[PDB]
Paper text:
The antibody COVA1-16 was recently isolated from an individual recovering from COVID-19 and cross-neutralizes SARS-CoV-2 (half-maximal inhibitory concentration [IC50], 0.13 μg/mL) and SARS-CoV (IC50, 2.5 μg/mL) pseudovirus (Brouwer et al., 2020). The heavy and light chains of COVA1-16 are encoded by immunoglobulin (IG) genes IGHV1-46, IGHD3-22, IGHJ1, IGKV1-33, and IGKJ4, with a relatively long CDR H3 of 20 amino acids. COVA1-16 utilizes a long complementarity-determining region (CDR) H3 to target a highly conserved epitope and can cross-neutralize SARS-CoV. Although its epitope does not overlap with the ACE2 receptor binding site, COVA1-16 is able to compete with ACE2 for binding to the RBD.
IGHV of COVA1-16 is only 1% somatically mutated in its nucleotide sequence (one amino acid change) from the germline gene, whereas its IGKV is 1.4% somatically mutated (three amino acid changes). The positively charged guanidinium of VH R100b also interacts with the partial negative dipole at the C terminus of a short α helix in the RBD (residues Y365–Y369). VH R100b is a somatically mutated residue (codon = AGG in the IGHD3-22-encoded region, where the germline residue is a Ser [codon = AGT]; Figure S1C).
Residue numbers in the entry:
A (entry chain H): 1 to 52, 52A, 53 to 82, 82A, 82B, 82C, 83 to 99, 100H, ...
B (entry chain L): 1 to 153, 157 to 211
The structure:
Amino acid sequence: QVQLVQSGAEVKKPGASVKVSCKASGYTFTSYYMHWVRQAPGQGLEWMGIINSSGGSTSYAQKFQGRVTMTRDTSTSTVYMELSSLRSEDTAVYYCARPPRNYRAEYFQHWGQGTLVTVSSASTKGPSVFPLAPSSKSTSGGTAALGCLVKDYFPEPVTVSWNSGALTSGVHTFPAVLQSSGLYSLSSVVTVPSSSLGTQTYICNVNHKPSNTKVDKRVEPK
Amino acid sequence: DIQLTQSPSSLSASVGDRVTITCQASQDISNYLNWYQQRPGKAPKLLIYDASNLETGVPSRFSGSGSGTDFTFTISSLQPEDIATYYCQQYDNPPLTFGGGTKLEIKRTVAAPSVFIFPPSDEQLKSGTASVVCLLNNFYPREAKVQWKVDNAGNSQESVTEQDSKDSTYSLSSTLTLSKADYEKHKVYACEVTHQGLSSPVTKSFNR
């Protein structure tokens, strides 16, 4: 299947640059254009520009003229978007997207997973992961709630899974809140049968790519 | 640039309802107008291209029509998994532009929150801070109130999930943070939840 796997999230100081990669597979790289589209948190979609995988000629929206550079390596099927002289309002999820064959058809049939770029003076901190243990006070008629609390981390995001992706039903991972300390805290919870608490192990898998933190915490009853 | 104006901004409809969203272009763009679906946490997804063509693999309940300046997008039978923000996009003239988005929520039956409370873990207390977590699970509609009562009565934070694709509910996480000493001081930790599903506020508590 067609895959566009994008590089990881990162924080950059104002005035610095980011280079976001997008490795493509499952199709003939050079037969397709690649576009870039960005989205600031809680906002709409903004087109940045287009590169021809064949040859590398580029065209950019006026507002990024002079600070965006799109390139591509045809030998690694990778597309690069570099944004220079970063400003606060460059904080966004950046997407690569490919349209169909041209044989003008600019609708994006495939998207990357997005890369959060955060423009900040603050420095990267990994998270502390604490368990929210199932108790009689997190039980409700045979339904028990457990979770884990991912605290004091920067920048966004973290990904949480449960039992390495096996447990998907009943899972809520809440949007991160920005504490007074300038750091983010998040909680992930899951509801399970109270029957399960003695028989099944629950482990939350927290991953913070910017700080290269990968924690696996077992949550057990109190 | 070609502006795209989308309407409504947001809407709530019931499963099975027919839903139509409109896009207007600031000038003639013929039929170079696409529709994308952005579900919570996910990248956008092409549903309709060139005003009316249904992208391959997209359910038949999605349709689009129009030409020139006025376009429509229709969901013929609204499904719970259709919760999302929908965007139009023109490509008649660069720069490619998007509309502002239409947020589509599901209207369902009233659902009261399941309230749970979590004392701070031992590990976190070792570190000198205590976070108490109050969970309001699977409730509808979205408006909910949480008041923290420490010893039966300023620094809590709340967070609401997007509407759940499965059962169309919301969930809410509230966290009260304290120094280890201030936590060890008080005895009763409660969160009092008010919501339309409850005939009266529910207090869920624990004793340290």
